[PDB]
Amino acid sequence: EQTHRAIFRFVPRHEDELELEVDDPLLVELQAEDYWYEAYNMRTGARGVFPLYYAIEVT
Amino acid sequence: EQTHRAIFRFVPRHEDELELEVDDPLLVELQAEDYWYEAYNMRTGARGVFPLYYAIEVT
Secondary structure, three states: OOOEEEOOOEOOOOOOEOOEOOOOEEEOOOOOEOOEEEEEEOOOOOEEEEEHHHEEEOO | OOOEEEOOOEOOOOOOEOOEOOOOEEEOOOOOEOOEEEEEEOOOOOEEEEEHHHEEEOO
16 A cells, blocks of 8 residues: 655656656655665556655655 | 755765755756756765755755
8 A cells, every 4th residue: 555655756867766746656665775765656657766855654 | 156055865876966965055057957956065075966856045
């Protein structure tokens, strides 16, 4: 189920990054490593990393 | 003359990235490209890109 939500537009520049649109639903299985999250984007079905401060926890 | 200030810690994972600490003063000369800024970090003297929402504009 959805763990996080994207809060800022993120356009990948690098080959391991996950594209985000504001309010995109995210599934984060693991703890952040060195201020990056690894996520499955539930709108786009893509997987990848994004910066720690671009998503919040959902309740 | 400083144009922006970092408000969140940004730990590079990629070779072209700029390391930010909270409060670093930044010189942004160029237009953002796909919501990344290119900057000179006035604390460290380092250059590179970081995601646009990690900094505020200073007047």
